[PDB]
C-alpha cells in the first residue's frame with residue numbers, strides 16, 4: 596500500500612514559499628543536499644566506532660551525483676546512515692517545524708533563501724529546481740522506503756520493492772522544464788567546486804550515457 600500524509604501546515608507553507616518566491620540563485624540546492632549526505636556519512640562512521648557491525652550493510656562512504664537527461668533527473672546518492680520510517684513520517688518534520696519558523700522569521704529581517712541551511716531545513720531547497728522529489732532510503736534498523744512529494748501539501752511513503760540499496764539515501768530530483776542546466780556536466784562541476792569543494796568523502800560526478 597502507498598500511504599499519503601499531510602505535511603504540517605508550516606512545512607507546506609515553507610514549500611509554497613520556495614516554489615513561489617522570485618529568487619534566481621537556485622544553484623545552492625546542490626550544496627544543501629551534499630551537506631545532508633556528508634552529515635549522514637559522518638553519523639554512520641561515528642556509530643561504527645562503537646559498533647563495527649553497522650558497516651555490514653557496506654563499508655564504502657561516498658556520494659554520487661547522477662544526471663539523466665532522458666528522465667530529466669538529478670540524483671544525489673550516498674551510503675550514509677539512512678532514514679527510518681519514523682524519520683520520514685514523523686521525526687524529521689517535528690524538528691523541521693522550529694527551523695521553519697526561525698527561517699521564515701529571518702527572511703523578514705532580510706535574510707535570503709540561500710541561508711536555509713542554517714535552519715536545518717535545507718532539504719526543501721530541492722523545490723527550487725525539482726517539480727517532484729523522490730527519496731529512496733535504507734536504515735540498518737528498518738526496511739527500504741520511498742518517500743515522494745510534488746508539494747501541494749501532501750507526501751507519500753511506501754516500502755520500496757525496487758533495487759535494494761544496502762544502506763543510504765537517493766534523492767531523485769525530477770527537474771522543472773526550465774531547470775535542465777543542472778543535468779549538464781560543466782554546470783554540476785562548477786557548483787560542486789564553488790560550494791562543496793571541502794566535503795570529506797569522495798563525490799563522483801557520473802556523466803551521460
Ligand SMILES: CCCCn1c(Cc2cc(OC)c(OC)c(OC)c2Cl)nc2c(N)ncnc21
Nearest residue numbers: 631632635675677687688691716718730742764
Ligand atoms: C535533516 C536531517 C536528516 C534528514 N536527511 C536529509 C534531509 C531531509 C530532511 C527532511 O526533513 C527536514 C526530510 O523530510 C521531508 C527528508 O525527506 C525524506 C530529507 Cl531527505 N537528507 C538525508 C540524507 N541524504 N541522509 C540521511 N538523512 C537525511
